[PDB]
Every structure is written in structure tokens, then in C-alpha cells.
Design an enzyme around this catalytic site. Structure first.
Site, PDB file in Angstrom:
ATOM      1  N   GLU A   1      -2.998  -6.373   4.645  1.00 30.83           N
ATOM      2  CA  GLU A   1      -3.436  -5.005   4.368  1.00 30.83           C
ATOM      3  C   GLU A   1      -4.894  -4.871   4.772  1.00 30.83           C
ATOM      4  O   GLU A   1      -5.584  -5.838   4.872  1.00 30.83           O
ATOM      5  CB  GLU A   1      -3.348  -4.626   2.883  1.00 30.83           C
TER       6      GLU A   1
ATOM      7  N   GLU B   1      -4.666   2.452  -0.975  1.00 36.62           N
ATOM      8  CA  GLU B   1      -5.337   1.209  -0.582  1.00 36.62           C
ATOM      9  C   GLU B   1      -5.975   0.611  -1.840  1.00 36.62           C
ATOM     10  O   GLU B   1      -6.298   1.357  -2.818  1.00 36.62           O
ATOM     11  CB  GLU B   1      -6.286   1.434   0.592  1.00 36.62           C
TER      12      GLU B   1
ATOM     13  N   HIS C   1       0.842  -1.229   0.000  1.00 42.53           N
ATOM     14  CA  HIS C   1       0.000   0.000   0.000  1.00 42.53           C
ATOM     15  C   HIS C   1       0.867   1.265   0.000  1.00 42.53           C
ATOM     16  O   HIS C   1       0.295   2.341  -0.198  1.00 42.53           O
ATOM     17  CB  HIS C   1      -1.002  -0.042   1.144  1.00 42.53           C
ATOM     18  N   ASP C   2       2.198   1.168   0.249  1.00 39.09           N
ATOM     19  CA  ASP C   2       3.076   2.352   0.206  1.00 39.09           C
ATOM     20  C   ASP C   2       3.415   2.789  -1.230  1.00 39.09           C
ATOM     21  O   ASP C   2       3.923   3.918  -1.379  1.00 39.09           O
ATOM     22  CB  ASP C   2       4.410   2.094   0.930  1.00 39.09           C
TER      23      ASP C   2
HETATM   24  N1  LIG Z   1      13.566  -0.316  -0.425  1.00 40.87           N
HETATM   25  C1  LIG Z   1      13.173  -0.851   0.717  1.00 40.87           C
HETATM   26  N2  LIG Z   1      13.675  -2.007   1.135  1.00 40.87           N
HETATM   27  C2  LIG Z   1      13.286  -2.546   2.295  1.00 40.87           C
HETATM   28  N3  LIG Z   1      12.388  -2.059   3.166  1.00 40.87           N
HETATM   29  C3  LIG Z   1      11.845  -0.877   2.769  1.00 40.87           C
HETATM   30  C4  LIG Z   1      12.192  -0.228   1.528  1.00 40.87           C
HETATM   31  N4  LIG Z   1      11.491   0.890   1.420  1.00 40.87           N
HETATM   32  C5  LIG Z   1      10.748   0.960   2.570  1.00 40.87           C
HETATM   33  N5  LIG Z   1      10.944  -0.120   3.374  1.00 40.87           N
HETATM   34  C6  LIG Z   1      10.283  -0.443   4.672  1.00 40.87           C
HETATM   35  O1  LIG Z   1       8.899  -0.683   4.439  1.00 40.87           O
HETATM   36  C7  LIG Z   1       8.253  -0.547   5.724  1.00 40.87           C
HETATM   37  C8  LIG Z   1       6.862  -0.014   5.459  1.00 40.87           C
HETATM   38  S1  LIG Z   1       5.896   0.257   6.980  1.00 40.87           S
HETATM   39  C9  LIG Z   1       5.406  -1.389   7.489  1.00 40.87           C
HETATM   40  C10 LIG Z   1       6.407  -2.111   8.364  1.00 40.87           C
HETATM   41  C11 LIG Z   1       5.975  -3.502   8.852  1.00 40.87           C
HETATM   42  N6  LIG Z   1       5.910  -4.504   7.763  1.00 40.87           N
HETATM   43  C12 LIG Z   1       4.641  -3.500   9.474  1.00 40.87           C
HETATM   44  O2  LIG Z   1       3.635  -3.974   8.926  1.00 40.87           O
HETATM   45  O3  LIG Z   1       4.612  -2.966  10.691  1.00 40.87           O
HETATM   46  C13 LIG Z   1       9.177   0.302   6.619  1.00 40.87           C
HETATM   47  O4  LIG Z   1       9.741  -0.402   7.706  1.00 40.87           O
HETATM   48  C14 LIG Z   1      10.251   0.755   5.631  1.00 40.87           C
HETATM   49  O5  LIG Z   1      11.530   1.135   6.181  1.00 40.87           O
HETATM   50  C1  LIG Z   2      -7.069   2.429  10.656  1.00 42.20           C
HETATM   51  O1  LIG Z   2      -6.041   3.350  11.057  1.00 42.20           O
HETATM   52  C2  LIG Z   2      -4.810   3.166  10.530  1.00 42.20           C
HETATM   53  C3  LIG Z   2      -4.463   2.116   9.684  1.00 42.20           C
HETATM   54  C4  LIG Z   2      -3.185   2.008   9.161  1.00 42.20           C
HETATM   55  C5  LIG Z   2      -2.154   2.928   9.505  1.00 42.20           C
HETATM   56  C6  LIG Z   2      -2.501   3.971  10.420  1.00 42.20           C
HETATM   57  C7  LIG Z   2      -3.775   4.096  10.913  1.00 42.20           C
HETATM   58  O2  LIG Z   2      -4.104   5.068  11.811  1.00 42.20           O
HETATM   59  C8  LIG Z   2      -0.774   2.859   8.941  1.00 42.20           C
HETATM   60  C9  LIG Z   2      -0.317   4.232   8.369  1.00 42.20           C
HETATM   61  C10 LIG Z   2       0.927   4.158   7.578  1.00 42.20           C
HETATM   62  C11 LIG Z   2       1.636   5.272   7.141  1.00 42.20           C
HETATM   63  C12 LIG Z   2       2.838   5.218   6.414  1.00 42.20           C
HETATM   64  C13 LIG Z   2       3.298   4.022   5.972  1.00 42.20           C
HETATM   65  O3  LIG Z   2       4.436   3.919   5.220  1.00 42.20           O
HETATM   66  C14 LIG Z   2       5.031   5.142   4.703  1.00 42.20           C
HETATM   67  C15 LIG Z   2       2.628   2.808   6.365  1.00 42.20           C
HETATM   68  O4  LIG Z   2       3.095   1.569   5.964  1.00 42.20           O
HETATM   69  C16 LIG Z   2       1.439   2.849   7.208  1.00 42.20           C
HETATM   70  C17 LIG Z   2       0.768   1.602   7.620  1.00 42.20           C
HETATM   71  N1  LIG Z   2      -0.633   1.872   7.894  1.00 42.20           N
HETATM   72  C18 LIG Z   2      -1.321   0.617   8.260  1.00 42.20           C
HETATM   73  C19 LIG Z   2      -2.823   0.866   8.274  1.00 42.20           C
END
Ligand SMILES: Nc1ncnc2c1ncn2[C@@H]1O[C@H](CSCC[C@H](N)C(=O)O)[C@@H](O)[C@H]1O
Ligand SMILES: COc1cc2c(cc1O)[C@@H]1Cc3ccc(OC)c(O)c3CN1CC2
Ligand SMILES: Nc1ncnc2c1ncn2[C@@H]1O[C@H](CSCC[C@H](N)C(=O)O)[C@@H](O)[C@H]1O
Ligand SMILES: COc1cc2c(cc1O)[C@@H]1Cc3ccc(OC)c(O)c3CN1CC2
Lengths: 342, 348
Positions: free
Chosen positions: A276, A308, A248-249
Site C-alpha cells: 500500500e 489510506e 485500503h478498499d
Molecule cells: N470479496 C472479495 N473476494 C475476493 N476479491 C475481492 C473481493 N472484493 C473485492 N475483491 C478484489 O479486490 C481487488 C481490489 S483492487 C487491487 C487488485 C490487485 N491486488 C492489485 O494490487 O492490482 C479487485 O480485483 C477486486 O475484484
Molecule cells: C498515486 O496515484 C494513484 C494511486 C493508487 C491508485 C490510483 C492512483 O491514481 C489506485 C486507485 C484505486 C481505486 C479503487 C480501488 O478499489 C475499489 C483500488 O484498489 C485502487 C488502488 N489504488 C492504488 C493506489
């Protein structure tokens, strides 16, 4: 009717900033240490704040924060008013067992770095290829995290603690970790996710994979190996993989490149699990909808292409990457495990 | 139920920042121009944004903002037979208040852009400091100066604040004039802390026999428009108030603590004639708070002023009476206007 709608619209900025202050002052935990069912005054709460002990006016100021949260159903109010926890604010009390709650993720989503990005949100509509985070900060979010240790910590801890309550929901429904012997968490953050998987499934050799700036601050977890790299260049070999809150990033082309890296590093018969919050086909005023719309708005502000997706859209990404049997598994309130099979 | 509460709590920062973006993009006015009961897509709305005209992705990003405001009931959401056989968005009672009026451009936009401005939100990031630290003010922690002193050094914030007060003032005085008849006999009205003069310009327009005088700080008077029937005066209301037959204090007492309020009101008393009055216009804190417009109309500025100025707070009718009595006034007359807004007359 201006003066009826001034209340409805003018409260919108105030409520989240009052909530953030209450979380930073540890109000909900302080209420809970009188008992979870306790109803306690602003002065009783302030009496448990050592920083307020030389401030005669602390309780009156605190009452002004709390009465707004009481009018907004975050606290119960009863007749100095007495405040108590609600279903929502119980989720802001660090658990007595292990300190887990929604506080860390909500502190991240209302952090100045995020709010400053939202101040540039209109740029994404007006200017081709602009990213609000970039406009606000002069670097992309993962580059920024590499140079800004405070933001790196707030973001990493937000993800990690939120990961724990997500996996508790996953393990109530999903059994697909059974009989895995090795799991690689691709973009696994500080490794909390894979630590919880290994705790539940003690035969899994867990590997946590992220950027150097994240791996170099990750704690040591039993049965977890940390590896630093760049997932878009290559992914370590792994028998199974996890991508939680990674697809989703990123936009479609970046997702397909990542998923092809995963495919090349999986064996025949291996799988990657996507976790997700899935965008439902009809949006409304409900948890499934907002659980997707909240990170949809955040990622629109925070990272190029982030958004999303629906089940159909995740299926199209996996198929473009060579995966063949998409298995979507609903967990809770829009949270899914989606299996892509090689 | 962590994964119910993620939605309830996580949406709270998102909604206002989505609303701010939609106001900056003039979404509500754009929908209004399609007519009564219009229901329009993100792509139709974006078509009316010249800045978006070389951005193929603009409508898809705009839709992501609008669908959150639809889920939040700020916009209505629907479709058509044709599209079943992109959702359409329409205005609601709340979003109607974000459409600048055809005749004069008035709406709640300017006050809502002020209360979500970065200078305000940065003060809210330091809100916890009022609880922890004796005599700390969140605005001063955030910006190294108090708000009125800051406004004299920062022309953008001065403009956002002064226009937020002025446009809101128009809305409020339209309500006042429907209920309150106490301007009718006046020959002169001095607006103490009157901002850029908009309030007293509207009083003089409605009551042309009133000689209007606007009084405020030098950095506000320097940017105030020339208004018919309004003389501008710069100074400091804590040092000296000009002589006036009658005075207005709108959204002034709630900026300050009790001792500052008594000092200012004594300055007004000295500058009023025998039989003169001062009108206080504020959203009055109800004696019992609930889940209603009257309660929130006081809690909103109560939280704002806690962050923005030392001593600032909303007050009950009894607490206003006590300030007037301490300054030498008699016969407090509280007059309810709308949803907690009052005129409170203090008689000399
Ligand atoms: N090129 C890359 N290689 C490896 N990890 C990366 C990346 N670009 C971003 N990330 C990592 O992608 C993650 C997205 S946030 C989600 C982190 C974790 N999977 C969770 O669900 O809690 C971050 O930790 C970030 O540092
Ligand atoms: C329902 O509420 C939420 C749901 C979620 C997040 C924060 C919320 O408050 C976070 C926000 C967030 C922001 C940046 C990210 O990477 C740059 C990332 O992976 C996430 C993950 N998501 C997971 C889903
Ligand atoms: N010492 C002082 N002397 C005069 N005006 C003051 C002041 N301190 C603050 N103010 C003014 O008090 C006003 C408070 S905001 C309300 C403005 C206007 N009465 C309205 O209702 O729209 C501002 O315009 C501010 O500049
Ligand atoms: C119900 O909603 C609202 C009510 C009110 C305000 C803003 C709102 O959104 C503004 C906010 C504000 C902030 C700072 C001020 O001086 C420093 C000030 O006088 C005012 C005025 N009040 C009037 C009451």
C-alpha cells in the site's frame, strides 16, 4: 484579484480532461516514435493519426489541447509550436519492451464511473453511511463490475499495468520472496502481480484469488493458478499471502475479518505481505503525500470504509487479526511492503 | 520515476472534484465566518453544516477533502501548541475568491460550478472527437444537441450556465469600470447575447442616463430577472439585432467560428447608427503564450469552447480586428482591462 485567481482555479478541471484526450489520441507515444528527444508539431503528430486523415482542422484542434498541456508542464513547448516529452509525459509512453505505462491507471481514475462518483462526493459528508459510487450507480463498485464488462476491463487493466511498475520498484529493495515456495495473492485482480513475482522467483507456485467476474476474464500466466471465491467468506490455504491495494478498499471491521481469514489459512511461520501507499505523518506538496491522498480521495468516493492508513494503523489491523512482528519496509515515494507474521 | 509521476499526474482529476465538493458544502464561506486569519478544523467547519448534524463521521470525511486542498495550496494548513503538547485550515488568495461577498453573494463559485458541471465534463469526455471527426462537436456527441438548443430543453443546465455567466459578469464589470470610461457619453446600450441581463443592469446602475436593452434567446429571457433600467428582448442575433445606439458583445464572439462572427457583426452594423460602436469584451489570446494569468485566462475558455460549441475559440487582437473589418467596422481600439480581459471597440 478575482481575475488573477480565475486562471489558478479555472484550469483545474481543464488540465485533466485535456490530458485524458491526449492519452486517448496516443499523443505521447506518437511524439516518442519520432525519437524520445524529438520536438514535433501538432500537424506532424496528427499525420500519424489515421482517424484524422480526412479532417483538415485536426491539427489546429490538437494544437489547442497540446498548448494547454505545454503550459501545465506535461509537454515542453518550443518555436506551429513544437512539443516534446517531459519527465511526466515519458510515464505515458507505453514502453517499447512491453507496453507498460501509467496510461491504464490514469484512464481508470478519470473514467466516467469514477468522475460520476466524485460528483456525489458531498453525500459522504452530509449523509451517514452513504457511498458516492452507490448514490451515482445504484450498486457498490464490485457488484457494478460484475454487471458492467467495460468498467470491469478498465478497472482490472488499470490495476494490472500499475502493478507492473509497482513490483519493479518492490524488487529493487525487497528480497522477502526468496525461499518462498507458494504465494496466494488475495484479491489479486487478473493475476499480473503474482505472474511478475513468479517470473522473478521461479520456484514460487503462484495462486491468484479474486471474484468470479475478475477470474473469468483473467489471462493465463505461466506458473499462476486462478481461483475464484469471496475472501470475506474464506481464503484458500496458502504458505504465504499478498494483499496489495485490498486493505485500503475496506473499513477496519472488514479488514480484521479478512486478515483473520488469512491467518486461519496460513501455516505457523507463514506471512501476509501488505502493499500500500502509506499515509505519512506530515502531508505536503510532495509525491509521498499525494501518492496516499489520491487513492484516499478515490476510495472515499468508490467503496464503503476505504481509506489510506499510517504504519501504526496497519499494525493495529494485523494485531487485531492475531499477527505478532509487523515489519514495515519502505520501497518508494510512500509505497511500502508491510509483513505481518503468524 | 513512475512513482513520482503517479502523484503529479494522478492528482489532476482529484483536485477539481475535491474543490467542487468543498464549494457545494460551502466550506470557504464557513471558514470566512470564523473571522480574519481564522484557522479551523474539519470538526469546527462540520459543526456549521446542519445536514451533517446526525453523521458522527462527517468531520473525518470532510478532513480527507480539506487535506488534499491544503496539500494543493488552496487552503493553508497549521496547528497549535495546545494540540502538539486534526489540522486547522485557513483561506488563501485563491480560496478568498470562493467566499460569496457579504453585500451581494458574488464570487467565482457560480462560474466554477458551471465549468465543472456534469454537462461540461460529459462534453470533455468526448473531446477527442474534434481531432478525429470532421465537424464533430463534443457537446453534441455527449448530449444529441448543441448547447443553446439543449439549454432550451433542460432548465437545470440553463440555470447553472446563466448564473455562471451572470455572477462572473459582475466581477468582470467591476474591473472594466476601474479602467474603461467609454460608457460615460452613451444614452443607450444594447447587450447582444446579454444573458439574463446582469451585465447591462450593472452598466445602467453605474451610468443612470443609459437606457439598457438586453437581448438573448427565448429560453434565457423567460427566466431573466426584472432589473432596473433594463428592457428585455428575445430573438436570434443571427436573424436580426434590435436597433441600438451602442452594442455590447461579451463572451459571444468566442462561442462561434469566423463566418458566424462576421454574420452577427454585420447584423450589429446594420442596427447601429453612423458613429455608433460595438464593444467586444473577451479574454484575448496573448500573441505569445506563457505561464501567466493572461495566458491561462484565454486557454481555459479556449478548451471549454472547443468542447461546447462549433467554431468557438479564443482570438488575438489581430484576429478580432479582422472580424470587425470584414463586417464593415473601422478604427479598432483595443483597451486592456486586467489579466488579458480587454474591451475592443469597433466603430461604425
Ligand atoms: N470479496 C472479495 N473476494 C475476493 N476479491 C475481492 C473481493 N472484493 C473485492 N475483491 C478484489 O479486490 C481487488 C481490489 S483492487 C487491487 C487488485 C490487485 N491486488 C492489485 O494490487 O492490482 C479487485 O480485483 C477486486 O475484484
Ligand atoms: C498515486 O496515484 C494513484 C494511486 C493508487 C491508485 C490510483 C492512483 O491514481 C489506485 C486507485 C484505486 C481505486 C479503487 C480501488 O478499489 C475499489 C483500488 O484498489 C485502487 C488502488 N489504488 C492504488 C493506489
Ligand atoms: N442566436 C442567438 N441569439 C441571441 N443570443 C444568443 C444566441 N446564441 C447564443 N446566445 C446567447 O449568447 C450568450 C453567450 S454566454 C455570455 C452571456 C453574457 N453576454 C455574459 O457575458 O455573461 C448566452 O446567453 C446565449 O443564450
Ligand atoms: C479564466 O476562466 C474562465 C474564463 C471564461 C469562462 C470560464 C472560466 O472558468 C467562460 C466559459 C464559457 C463557456 C461557454 C460559453 O458559451 C457557450 C461561454 O460564453 C463562456 C464564457 N467564458 C468566459 C471566459
Amino acid at each position: 484579484c478575482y481575475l488573477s485567481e480565475t486562471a489558478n482555479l479555472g484550469k483545474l478541471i481543464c488540465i485533466p480532461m485535456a490530458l485524458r484526450a491526449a492519452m486517448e489520441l496516443n499523443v505521447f507515444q506518437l511524439i516518442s516514435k519520432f525519437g524520445t528527444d524529438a520536438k514535433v508539431s501538432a500537424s506532424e503528430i496528427a499525420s500519424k493519426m489515421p482517424n484524422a486523415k480526412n479532417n483538415p482542422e485536426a491539427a489546429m484542434y490538437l494544437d489547442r489541447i497540446l498548448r494547454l498541456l505545454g503550459a501545465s508542464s506535461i509537454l515542453s513547448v518550443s518555436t506551429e509550436k513544437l512539443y516534446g516529452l517531459t519527465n511526466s509525459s515519458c510515464c505515458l509512453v507505453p514502453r517499447q519492451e512491453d507496453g507498460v505505462s501509467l496510461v491504464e491507471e490514469l484512464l481508470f481514475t478519470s473514467d466516467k464511473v469514477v468522475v460520476d462518483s466524485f460528483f456525489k462526493l458531498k453525500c459522504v459528508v452530509e449523509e451517514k453511511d452513504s457511498v458516492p459510487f452507490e448514490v451515482a450507480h445504484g450498486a457498490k463498485i464490485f457488484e457494478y463490475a460484475a454487471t458492467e464488462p467495460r468498467m470491469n476491463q478498465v478497472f482490472n487493466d488499470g490495476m494490472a499495468v500499475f502493478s507492473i511498475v509497482v513490483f519493479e520498484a518492490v524488487f529493487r529493495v525487497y528480497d522477502g520472496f526468496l525461499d518462498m515456495k507458494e504465494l496466494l495473492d488475495v484479491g489479486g485482480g487478473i493475476g499480473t502481480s503474482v505472474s511478475k513475482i513468479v517470473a522473478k522467483y521461479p520456484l514460487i507456485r503462484g495462486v491468484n484469488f479474486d471474484l468470479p467476474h475478475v477470474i473469468s476474464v483473467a489471462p493465463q500466466y505461466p506458473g499462476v493458478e486462478h481461483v475464484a471465491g469471496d475472501m470475506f467468506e474464506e481464503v484458500p490455504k496458502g504458505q504465504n499471502m499478498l494483499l496489495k491495494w485490498v486493505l485500503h478498499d475496506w473499513g477496519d471491521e472488514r479488514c480484521v475479518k479478512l486478515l483473520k481469514n488469512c491467518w486461519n489459512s496460513l501455516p505457523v511461520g507463514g506471512k501476509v505481505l501488505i502493499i500500500e501507499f502509506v499515509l505519512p505523518n506530515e502531508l505536503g506538496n510532495n509525491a509521498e503525500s499525494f501518492n496516499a491522498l489520491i487513492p484516499d480521495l478515490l476510495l472515499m468516493a468508490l467503496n464503503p470504509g476505504g481509506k489510506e492508513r499510517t504504519i501504526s494503523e496497519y499494525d493495529d489491523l494485523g494485531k487485531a487479526a492475531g499477527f505478532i512482528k509487523t515489519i514495515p519496509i519502505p520501497i518508494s515515494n510512500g509505497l511500502h511492503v508491510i509483513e505481518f507474521h503468524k
